[PDB]
């Protein structure tokens, strides 16, 4: 029971990819439309999400085997999983102490209330926080966190995927890497893997609810005009 | 030779409209994506222009007779004239002393160089400055400035206009008001009116060049993604 010189290369890649597309100082946030605490946080959070999508795309492109999919599959996967990858990667800034995402100073500490100022219900936010708390409680190794993001992105059960035999293959190889990594490198991690797969299940429902909330926003031009072309294109139903 | 109780009501309306849609403190600019001095000013200037378009729409809706046009005509006029109304209204912030638009502090003082950081050529900017200098030299009364904006918007010679017999009527009434106002209220203004109409001619060419520059930008997704949904819709060729 020892990782193969191919399983660790996959791990090397995903971890470097994450480092290349995730800044722990959050210094680009000053370039977003500033936060205001009628849907005052919408501009800021739309910018955040748009930016994060760009980052998720950069990451996805570095997932072993992703570049080889058809552009359609790459798109079909990004569109379906974008919000979930975003929810996953945000855990890095999320804080149990204050139950908010802490991206620096008074301005970039996002709490439940801030997101409601962006067209979301206090009600719909409960699960997201709960999910962040459960995910944070797992205390994932960077290897696992980064692996979980890649596995999520390569879910075959996404509307629009064509070659779902091949995405299933890439994801299984990834799942294997993670199971092996946990068994070999993660003491006390006997039941961790399954808790992680459970998280993917939680992501699907969170994705579902968001999609609904987002439709409501995107249908009112006064609100939709606050979005970005990227956000509108990624969360839009335009089908190709 | 004395203005009619109807010509002054038109003047009252356009002047109040301008006051309602133009802030001389420029305090909303802090809500734009901040300026950076690869096309670093694009985000800021796109936000500025998007905001200004919103303001131009607010103004247009208060131009006597504009609300009565078909929604198509209103749109056809806004789309064609938007950039020109913007160029006209900016003269208020433009400064002969420094040949820049001065909207407050180091951050919001826009010079020729800043606009080039937004995908425009130093070459294409020459006329805009020249135009601002000529327009500023006219030292227009607020009544005239505001009148000139309304006349520009109701130009009948715009792609897409349907009822160009009726826009011509509204614009002529406006032109009359301005000619009368100048004759009666503007000492030393014998030759001013014609210089103002000449400015409309200058706007057409400036509109033309911008449209070209804008096409170049809007065709590169990496640049187009920096625009706003409003800008993209107003300067887009989508035809209806």
């Amino acid at each position: 029971h020892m990782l193969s010189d191919e399983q660790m290369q996959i791990i090397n890649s995903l971890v470097e990819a994450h480092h290349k597309t995730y800044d722990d100082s959050y210094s680009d946030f000053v370039r977003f439309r500033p936060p205001v605490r009628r849907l005052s946080m919408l501009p800021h959070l739309a910018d955040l999400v748009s930016y994060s999508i760009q980052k998720v795309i950069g990451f996805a492109k570095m997932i072993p085997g992703f570049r080889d999919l058809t552009a359609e599959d790459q798109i079909a996967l990004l569109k379906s999983s974008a919000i979930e990858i975003i929810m996953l990667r945000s855990n890095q800034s999320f804080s149990l102490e204050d139950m908010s995402w802490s991206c620096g100073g008074p301005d970039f500490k996002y709490c439940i209330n801030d997101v409601t100022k962006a067209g979301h219900t206090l009600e719909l936010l409960e699960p997201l926080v709960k999910f962040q708390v459960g995910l944070k409680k797992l205390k994932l190794h960077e290897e696992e966190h980064v692996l979980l993001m890649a596995i999520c992105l390569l879910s075959p059960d996404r509307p629009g995927v064509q070659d779902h035999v091949r995405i299933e293959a890439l994801q299984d190889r990834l799942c294997d890497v993670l199971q092996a990594y946990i068994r070999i490198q993660h003491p006390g991690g006997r039941l961790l893997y399954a808790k992680m797969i459970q998280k993917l299940a939680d992501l699907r429902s969170l994705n579902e609810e968001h999609s609904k909330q987002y439709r409501s926003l995107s249908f009112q031009p006064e609100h939709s005009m606050q979005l970005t072309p990227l956000v509108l294109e990624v969360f839009g139903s335009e089908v190709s | 030779h004395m203005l009619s109780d109807e010509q002054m009501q038109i003047i009252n309306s356009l002047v109040e409209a301008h006051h309602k849609t133009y802030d001389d403190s420029y305090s909303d600019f802090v809500r734009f994506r901040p300026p950076v001095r690869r096309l670093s000013m694009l985000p800021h200037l796109a936000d500025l222009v998007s905001y200004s378009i919103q303001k131009v729409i607010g103004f247009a809706k208060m131009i006597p007779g504009f609300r009565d046009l078909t929604a198509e005509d209103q749109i056809a006029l806004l789309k064609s004239s938007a950039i020109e109304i913007i160029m006209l209204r900016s003269n208020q912030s433009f400064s002969l002393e420094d040949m820049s638009w001065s909207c407050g502090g180091p951050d919001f003082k826009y010079c020729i160089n800043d606009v080039t950081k937004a995908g425009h050529t130093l070459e294409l900017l020459e006329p805009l400055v020249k135009f601002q200098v000529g327009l500023k030299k006219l030292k227009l009364h607020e009544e005239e400035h505001v009148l000139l904006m309304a006349i520009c918007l109701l130009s009948p010679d715009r792609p897409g206009v349907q009822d160009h017999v009726r826009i011509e009527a509204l614009q002529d009434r406006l032109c009359d008001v301005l000619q009368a106002y100048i004759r009666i209220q503007h000492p030393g203004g014998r030759l001013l009116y014609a210089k103002m109409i000449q400015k409309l001619a200058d706007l057409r060419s400036l509109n033309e060049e911008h449209s070209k520059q804008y096409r170049s930008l809007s065709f590169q997704p990496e640049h187009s993604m920096q625009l706003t949904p409003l800008v993209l819709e107003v300067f887009g060729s989508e035809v209806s």
Binding site: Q54, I57, K61, A71, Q74, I75, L78, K79, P229, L230, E233, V234, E238, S240 | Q220, P221, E222, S224, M225
Partner: peptide, 10 residues
């Protein structure tokens, strides 16, 4: 048509 996504995907 996904102009931007296709662009960003290199």
């Amino acid at each position: 048509k996904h102009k931007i996504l296709h662009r960003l995907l290199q």
